[PDB]
Design a protein around this ligand. Structure first.
Ligand code: HEM
Ligand code: HEM
Ligand SMILES: N=C(NCCC[C@H](N)C(=O)N[C@@H](CCN)C(N)=O)N[N+](=O)[O-]
Ligand SMILES: N=C(NCCC[C@H](N)C(=O)N[C@@H](CCN)C(N)=O)N[N+](=O)[O-]
Ligand SMILES: C[C@H](O)[C@H](O)[C@H]1CNc2nc(N)[nH]c(=O)c2N1
Ligand SMILES: C[C@H](O)[C@H](O)[C@H]1CNc2nc(N)[nH]c(=O)c2N1
Ligand SMILES: [Zn+2]
Lengths: 407, 410
């Protein structure tokens, strides 16, 4: 069927047909919606490959051509013989860009076509991975004028020689459990911060300690490496009015770079595919800084602002939230590092949605993730109906390696 | 089947078995989620089973399942249906049914209060004047001089579909909206079409910014009739700020009694098309949506200007700053006038406790995340971090088409 999507603020209705080409399941049923759940063979492979090549050739206006047919046969014979195949550089680039295009939880997809792809399929070791990663970080950071990029390591073979980056993001802060029973640094990384020590790392036991990369190549045991500090761009956070702010001693890194997902293109699985773009202000100011299970800093900021924290209805938490997020943005813009506010980013997404609807017939989107964690309804996406469904190529979740690795 | 739901802030995991009793569809499929879509005359045939299901739930709730009283009621209803094609609920079943439609309302964050609902039985009502009297009594009881009390008034159920009782207003109390020839709107933009119908029907509009609309009431399928709610019965709150003395000069005020009046209440297969209900406001409803939605009063700029915020660029977060103050004001004004209201922090925290309680004593709590999470400060409320399962249980409150689109004028 053909579904319709309405924006309740502008009345604009869009019709969706792209969903009709969905393959994977959503987790929902006619009886129950799981829209808010965080995570709901040669014979198998060729179909997948064919589906992919078909869209690739269609995208380049050579659908059904001899080239298309030839390629389809070549891959067909390759799988039948090698039980797998290799993507052409062209198909690789198209695949990665589209996996981003299809990321229903990503609000910055208007940038999807401008992705620098780094082919690391010739990589064989952890030092090699480190080398490729350092080059990605430097390229993408670009002294503050961030550029989206992804580095693709060798695809899975027999699952016994998988490449993996154990970190969740290339750059994050350490987390240690203290005697107090409290947590020093980032609580979200406590466990990882331990496996780094349990492996050899010498933690400074600080509040913002850039973690070491834990790289795994060809199924081997992961190895540690410290990213040249000169390559980790960091922003000290200050407020454009509260000169006391700085004493909070807060800072964040400029490069968001998801490194634990799995990239699936034409059936092939790339288990190590770190990618990066740039931050939306709220990710740091609202989630990293104010989540109760994270740096949980609202109370401190509240106190220095000297506001009545006696009653929830004074909305001190909300007032502080705003100020903190004003600081994050302020600091990044001041240090000339790329960053986008939730207002501008959501506006962009709406524009992207409209482009996608008319040039592609739709845009899979997960409302639960697209709407910013603060000021939801004053951003346009809140009033925008969205249809969520899975399309390939795609970025998928995968088990944390330390729960699957056989040392 | 069992389903796990987890809170990513506390790691608490709950198990849901309640969903096994969901009959109605959700709009989603194994291939598509319609979770953010706002809205995705029965036969004797499908009526008795609907009745039986309900009566079994009722008798089980009172620990009399399988009793003689239970079996006789089933036989009594079955006969009545075969005989008259419908059936009447006992007062007790009506009350139980009403409370459960609220208890099952997956988009309602105030459900911790479900068991305390005052049900007014208006099934003996035959005319619009009769409806007006019932509604006046409901508004006065509910308002209770500012100490709000949850209530619902239930008018006669649908029979053949040509004799429906309907409250044409979407809420018993709402402000008029007027579109000017220059394209701008005076009052509340959301109520413009309804305001026009009221004028066409004879209402003398005072054409101001906060004019309480007249009730347009339809009884037994007849053409609707106009009634003005006694002003002394309509409690309102002037909006001022704890620190901004100029806020009061924005000329804002809101009514204190929220009362949805356009939903359909379904109990045991029976359809109640006019069932106005009221509780009390969560601050953000007024402060974030009614006041700051671009298509509503939209006061962000004017408030931002007076605060002398940097409006040159969005990254100054002037909108976000103005938003908090306005919401501080709404809460402050209500508490000062001693009119019940709840802020989003307290409301969401209570809902999590209610939800956990429901999972243990009931096996679940259908909830719509998209609606439950507040329109501001989303992630600093516990619900944002809570996984929820949405499904439909009856009894329930359902949407129904606006009456002006279906009514056959006499
Ligand atoms: C350049 C601007 C970019 C912006 C502003 C942006 C913004 C966002 C935001 C705010 C999220 C949610 C993060 C969270 O809540 O954890 C997100 C998620 C995501 N983005 Fe983008 N993104 C950008 C670039 C990228 C790139 C370059 C890719 C892919 C190559 C991408 C793929 C995804 C995926 C797959 C997710 C979901 C990850 C998860 O489930 O944890 N994003 N993005
Ligand atoms: C005790 C006070 C109550 C509070 C604080 C509360 C709060 C809320 C809020 C914030 C909404 C969302 C409104 C919107 O965004 O349009 C809502 C929706 C809802 N509530 Fe409650 N509520 C209360 C009492 C009730 C009562 C008395 C009933 C039923 C007897 C009820 C039934 C529902 C239903 C059916 C919806 C969804 C309405 C729609 O879809 O438009 N609520 N509630
Ligand atoms: N802006 C991005 N955000 C995604 C990564 C940052 C995100 N806020 C985050 O903390 N993700 C966690 C996963 C959150 N559950 C991680 N993978 O370390 N991506 N980007 O490439 O531009
Ligand atoms: N707090 C309540 N809120 C629901 C009613 C107010 C809501 N903010 C509102 O404006 N609802 C619109 C529907 C909004 N789409 C209506 N039916 O007039 N309900 N209550 O019983 O206490
Ligand atoms: C339970 C719920 O799914 C969870 O808290 C989601 C909500 N929306 C989100 N949205 C984004 N962008 N990122 C998140 O981590 C979440 N967490
Ligand atoms: C499109 C989207 O579903 C829509 O704007 C929803 C989102 N969440 C909501 N939540 C509540 N409580 N009330 C609403 O009117 C809405 N509108
Ligand atoms: Zn769904």
């Amino acid at each position: 069927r053909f579904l319709k999507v309405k924006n309740w603020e502008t009345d604009v209705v869009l019709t969706d047909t792209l969903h009709l080409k969905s393959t994977l399941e959503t987790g929902c049923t006619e009886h129950i919606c799981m829209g808010s759940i965080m995570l709901p063979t040669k014979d198998q492979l060729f179909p997948l490959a064919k589906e992919f090549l078909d869209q690739y050739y269609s995208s380049i206006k050579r659908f059904g051509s001899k080239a298309h047919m030839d390629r389809l046969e070549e891959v067909n014979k390759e799988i039948e013989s090698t039980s797998t195949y290799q993507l052409k550089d062209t198909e690789l680039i198209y695949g990665a860009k589209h996996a981003w295009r299809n990321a229903s939880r990503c609000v910055g997809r208007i940038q999807w076509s401008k992705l620098q792809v780094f082919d690391a399929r010739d990589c064989t070791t952890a030092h090699g991975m480190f080398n490729y990663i350092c080059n990605h970080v430097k390229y993408a950071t670009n002294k503050g004028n961030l550029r989206s990029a992804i580095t693709i390591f060798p695809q899975r073979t027999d699952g016994k020689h998988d490449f993996r980056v154990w970190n969740s993001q290339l750059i994050r802060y350490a987390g240690y459990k203290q005697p107090d029973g409290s947590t020093l640094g980032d609580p979200a990384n406590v466990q990882f911060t331990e496996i780094c020590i349990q492996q050899g790392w010498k933690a400074p036991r600080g509040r913002f300690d850039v973690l070491p990369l834990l790289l795994q190549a060809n199924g081997n045991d992961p190895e540690l490496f410290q990213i040249p500090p000169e390559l980790v761009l960091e922003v000290p956070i200050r407020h454009p009015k509260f000169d006391w702010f700085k004493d909070l001693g807060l800072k964040w890194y400029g490069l968001p770079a998801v490194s634990n997902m799995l990239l699936e293109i034409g059936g092939l699985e790339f288990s190590a595919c770190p990618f990066s773009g740039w931050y939306m202000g709220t990710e740091i100011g609202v989630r990293d800084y104010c989540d109760n299970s994270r740096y949980n800093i609202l109370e401190e900021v509240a106190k220095k602002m000297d506001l009545d924290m006696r009653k929830t209805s004074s909305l001190w938490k909300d007032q502080a939230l705003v100020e903190i997020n004003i600081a994050v943005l302020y600091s990044f813009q001041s240090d000339k590092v790329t960053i986008v506010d939730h207002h501008s980013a959501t506006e962009s997404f709406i524009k992207h949605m409209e482009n996608e609807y008319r040039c592609r017939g739709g845009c899979p989107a997960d409302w639960v993730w697209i709407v910013p964690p603060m000021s939801g309804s004053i951003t346009p996406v809140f009033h925008q109906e969205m249809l969520n469904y899975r399309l390939t190529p795609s970025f998928e979740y995968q088990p944390d390696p330390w729960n699957t690795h056989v040392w």
